[PDB]
Amino acid sequence: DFHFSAIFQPTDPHHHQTEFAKVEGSEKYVEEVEVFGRQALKVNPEALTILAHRAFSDVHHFFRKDHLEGWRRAIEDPEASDNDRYVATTLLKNACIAAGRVLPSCQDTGTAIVLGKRGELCWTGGEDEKYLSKGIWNAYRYHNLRYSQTAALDMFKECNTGDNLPAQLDLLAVPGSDYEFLFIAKGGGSANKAYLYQETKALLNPKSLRAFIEEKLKTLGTAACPPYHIALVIGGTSAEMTMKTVKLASCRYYDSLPTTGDKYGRAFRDPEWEKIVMEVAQKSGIGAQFGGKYFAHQARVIRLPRHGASCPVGLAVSCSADRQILAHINKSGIYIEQLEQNPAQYLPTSVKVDLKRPIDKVRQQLSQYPVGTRVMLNGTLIVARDIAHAKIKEMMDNGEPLPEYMKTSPIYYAGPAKTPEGYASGSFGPATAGRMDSYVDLFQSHGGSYITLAKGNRSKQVTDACKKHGGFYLGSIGGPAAILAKDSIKQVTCLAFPELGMEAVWKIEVEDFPAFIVVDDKGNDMYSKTLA
Amino acid sequence: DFHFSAIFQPTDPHHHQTEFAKVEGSEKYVEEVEVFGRQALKVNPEALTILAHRAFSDVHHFFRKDHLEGWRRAIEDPEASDNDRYVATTLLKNACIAAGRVLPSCQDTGTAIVLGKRGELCWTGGEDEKYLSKGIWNAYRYHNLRYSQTAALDMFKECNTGDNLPAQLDLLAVPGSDYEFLFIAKGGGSANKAYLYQETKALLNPKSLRAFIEEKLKTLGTAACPPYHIALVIGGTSAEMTMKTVKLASCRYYDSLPTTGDKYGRAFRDPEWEKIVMEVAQKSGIGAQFGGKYFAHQARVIRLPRHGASCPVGLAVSCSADRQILAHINKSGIYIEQLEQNPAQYLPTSVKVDLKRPIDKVRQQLSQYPVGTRVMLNGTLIVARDIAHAKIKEMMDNGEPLPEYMKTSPIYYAGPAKTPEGYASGSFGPATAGRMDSYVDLFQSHGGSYITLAKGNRSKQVTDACKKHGGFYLGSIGGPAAILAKDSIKQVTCLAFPELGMEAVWKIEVEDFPAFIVVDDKGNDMYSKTLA
C-alpha cells in the first residue's frame, strides 16, 4: 500500500541537456575509489574553490542561448514596439561588451548563491562551505565585480563586508558519488521581485487564476529590468519550499519536470498556463521596460501539492542580468556549463539635454516635453542610493541642510562595480527608483532632488511630488551597465560617505546618457496606462 | 585577507540543551568503520523509518516545556484577561487528553517536514527519502491522525493522497559522520501565517521598524490559534532563505545563536527587539484568541545580512499545535527529543443555545446578546470546509439551488482526524473561518449559512453579510481538538460528498460546545477594536 513518490521527478535530473566544458587538468583533483563494495569519489576540496571561482567569473560576461534568443526575438518581431527593439538592442550590445571579459554585464554583480548536491559517497573532507566561499571570494576580489553584501553590526548599524561575502550555501545530501551544482549570481533588484502570496481553494479555478495572474504581474512593473523570465509556483508544502521552487523555476532548473500530475502529488510544469502567463505578459502593454510586447522572455509555471488548508503561491523573475551556471564534479574532473561567448551573432530621435547649466534651466527644458520623450544627458550626475538617502534624511531631521550636492545636478540612483585598470569607470547602470520614493517629496520640499535618474516605475507619491515642486523622474535603460560605463561615463569621483563602498555619494561626468522622461512636472507618468 | 564566516553560528549546534531519550536497542542499526583514515558510520536505513515513525507519533500527544509554561503563564498572570485564562486552561486540558496517546492534540495533524543533516561520512545507502517517507507513512496510517495532503491531478483537479504524503524532506550535507534531525508536524493554519515582505533600508530605523511590527502582527489575527510563538527575520540572502530562517526560528531551532553582529555578516538573535515584539503583542489587546494579553508565548527575532539593494523580511508563528522534535543518529544509536509526558502538572457564565430548534429560533436567541458573549451549543452541526464550499458554489453557478442541508443547522468549518476504535469521533476542532469568507454573503442570500462556527477573525464582507441577512459568526476556541472530541462530539455521520475524505460534508451531534459570538446580526465584531 505504501508507495514513495518524490515531489520533483525531472526527466533530466543531471541536466544532460546542458553543454559543459571540463576544466583542463582537473582530473587531478578527483580519484574514484571502491569502499565496502560501492563506488566512491575522493574530491580535493581545492576543486570547490577552483569551480566557484570560475563560475562566479564567467557568469558575469556571458549569457545562455534562451536569454539571448529572447532579445533577438524582441528585435525581429514586427509586433514589438520601437521601445522594445531599442531596449533589446541596447542589452545585446551591452552583452557584447561584457563578453570582452573586463566589464561585468551589470554593476550589480549579485549575491553569490550555491545550490550543491553532494552524493553520499562523494568525499570532500567536509569543509565545502569554506572552500566554496574562498572561490567566491577570489572571483569578487580579483575581478572587476562589486562588493554588495551589507553586514548588520546591530539591528540598524550596518557596514559593507568588503568582499561580497557571505554567500548563500545550500548544500544537499543526495545519492551517488558525484557533486552537482547550480551557481546563481542573483541581482538585488530581481531578488526583490520574489513574492509570496497566501491564497485558498477559491483561487483554484480558471477565471480566478487568470485574474490573479493579470493583477500580480503588474506589481512586478519594470523595476527588475525586463524582459523577464517569469516563474509562477502554485502550491507547495511550505512558504519556504514554494519560494525555493519559484527561484529554481526562474533559473529553468525544473524545465524537464513532467507535465501532468498524479494521485501521489508529484510536481509538474503546466505548459497551458505558461502560455496564459505569456499571453497576459504580452497583452499587458508593459513591454521591454518602456511599453510594448516584450514584458517577458518566457514563463515557467509549476504546480505543487498542498496541505488542504493551504495554498502558497510564489512569483519571481530572472532579470536582464540572467546569471546562473550549472556544474558538476565527477570521476573525470570539474565540468562547468558552457555559456554563449559570441553574443554578437544574435544582433540583427532624441532630445539633447545639457546638464552643465543651473538646475532650473534644465528643469525648464525638460518641462517642454511630454512623458515618453527619449533624452540624452550630457554633464554632471550626482550619484546616491539607499543608504545615502537615509543618512541625508537623518541629517535634515537633526536640523542640518540638504547638502549642496543634492541641489546642483540630477540624482542618479546607482552604485558602481570596481574600475578596471586604465578604465574611466567600472560597470555603472541604474538601481531601482521605487526604493527611494519615500525621500522625493521631502527632498524636493527642501530644495533638491528635482531631477532623479534611475529605472523602474515609481509610486503615486513621486508623481504628486514632481507636480507639486516642478520635478522630473528620468528612466534610464535598466541593465546595460557595461556599455554605459564604456561609452557614457567619463569621470568618476567619490564625493561623500566613502565608508559606504559602492553606496557612497559619487560625482560623475557623463556624455550621451540615454533616458526617457517617465514622470514630468505636470502629474503625468508614462506607466500610468500599463501599470495602473 | 580571506576569512570564512558561516552565517549561522549557534553556540549549541548539536542541541545539548535539549533532553533526548535513546531508542532501546537502536545501536544495532549502526556500525563504526574507518576508511582512508577517517571515521565513518554505517547506518541501516531502517533506522530512518523507525525514527520518523516515533517522531511523527510522539509529537501529536506531547509538548515542549516552554509551550506548556506559556499556557500556565496565561493562567497565573494577574494581567491575563479572563478569556486569556479560559483559553489557556482549555488548551492545557486538551493537552492532558492528548497525552493519553489516543487522540492527537489537533485534528490538523499537519504536513510532515523533515530537516535532516547527514554527515559526509554517514552512509545510509542513499535511499533516505523513501525510508523516511515510510516512517511518516507508518505514523499517519497506523495512528488516529489525519490525511491532509492534496494532490493536483491537473492545475485545478485535486484529490487527497490518502496517506499524508508527500513529506517535505530537506536533507543537507554537513561535516562529520552523524545524522541530525528536526521533525515538524506543521499545521496548515500556522503555515498560512508565514509572510514574506520585500522592504528597504527605509524600514531600518527604530521608529519605522516598531510601526512595521505593530502593523504586521495585527495581520496575523487569531486565525492561527494563538498564543503564538512569534518569529521575525529581518534581512536574508534571498526570499527562500529568509522564510526558511523564520520557520526554524519559530521552532526555537536558532535559540543559541550569538546576540551581536560582526563585520562578516553573521546572523544574530536580537533580544532587545524580541522584547519589543512581546510588548507590541501584549499591548495589542488581541489576547489568547478572544481579547487580552496573551497574543504571544514568546518572540524570536533574527537579524540577517542583506544585499544592499534588498531587505526581505519574514514573519511566521508556531500555533497552539506547536509540534517539533529534535533527533540524531550516532555511534550509540537513535536519540529522540524527550517531550513533556505529564502536562497536568502545569494546570493550577455562558448562554445555553439549543440547536435542535428551527434555525430562525436560534437566530432570535443569538440576536439578544452582544458580541463577546460566551455560548454553549447543544445540537446538530453541518460540517463543511474549503472544498465543499467551492463545490456548492460551483453547483449554484450552474443554476442548482443551495442544498437544504446548508439551511437547517449552523455550518461548522472543520475536518476530523480518524476515529479511534470505540470512540464517537476523532479529534475534531475548528478550521480557519477567513478562508470561507467569499461564500457567506452568497449562501445567506440563498437562505443558508446564517450561523457559521469556526475560529479566527473574518473580513469586513462577513460582518456586512451577517448584518444584511440576520446572521452570526461563532468563534470556537482554536486548537482543543482532542477535548472537543472526547467531551462534546457525540455522533458523526457523513451526509454528502463522501469521496472528499475529511473534506466531505458531515452531520454531527454536539453537547456543551463552547464558542463566542464574534459577529452578530447588527454590524458588530468583537475583533473590530483589536484587529482594526
Ligand code: SF4
Ligand atoms: S540592475 Fe537590473 S539587470 Fe542588474 S541585477 Fe538589478 S534588476 Fe538585474
Ligand code: SF4
Ligand atoms: S492549532 Fe489551529 S492553526 Fe494550529 S494546526 Fe490546529 S487548527 Fe491549525
